[PDB]
Amino acid sequence: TNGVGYQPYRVVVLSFELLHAPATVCGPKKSTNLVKNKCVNFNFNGLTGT
């Protein structure tokens, strides 16, 4: 019966703090398919090379 202005905005203020208890809410990876017998570049657990 009141207005949408009063209708609650379901609010999640993402309070996050940095550089303590080492970074744990993190960014994922996107994979590919394996290739063989081809001079290519690669990335494995941070390790990168060709």
């Binding site: 303590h20 208890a21 080492p22 744990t24």
Partner: protein
Amino acid sequence: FKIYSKHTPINLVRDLPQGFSALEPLVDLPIGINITRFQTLLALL
């Protein structure tokens, strides 16, 4: 708090013998807390 661990099939009951055997990284604890003293706690007339 890295936990290097290993069980080797010794066959004796008393003071550590000679011989060679490595350990293995069994589990790490990705905490960042401060620790400087420990205490044993057994399975406690």
